[PDB]
Design a protein around this nucleic acid. Structure first.
Length: 49
DNA sequence: ATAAAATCACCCGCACAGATTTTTTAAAACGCGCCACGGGATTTTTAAACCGGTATTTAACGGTGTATGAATCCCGTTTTATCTTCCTTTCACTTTCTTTCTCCAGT
């Protein structure tokens, strides 16, 4: 949902991971930032999903 | 696989406190020498003991009114007895490197 709100679509330029992690932590997820990045990493590995 | 909490190396200038490192200086020492000083044997002089006597000067003695010495209670100081420790050391074990002995396929 946070990625959708920012307008980070599939046919546009990339965005840095730090900005997305900061938005997620500061607006929706009241937890640490390392776990969020680790979760994001797993969803982009071809050998995991 | 999601959560909670943590840790370390280096680069760039500048100012200063502390730790080696030369460098200089005053004290202690050695060798040689000479003359200042003290020992020994005469002359000389004077310090103190001794007789007086006199004229003071001190210490022992009897009342009052304190200042302090021994005793008690504490708390910082230093000694002494008492624990743990890291480097030296070998040493039996393990590991790892070097040479040798075959196999052995090919012709």
């Amino acid at each position: 949902y946070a990625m959708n709100v920012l307008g980070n679509d599939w046919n546009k330029a990339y965005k840095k991971s730090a900005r997305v992690v900061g938005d997620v932590i500061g607006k929706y997820h009241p937890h640490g930032d390392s776990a969020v990045y680790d979760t994001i990493v797993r969803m982009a590995q071809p050998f995991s999903l």
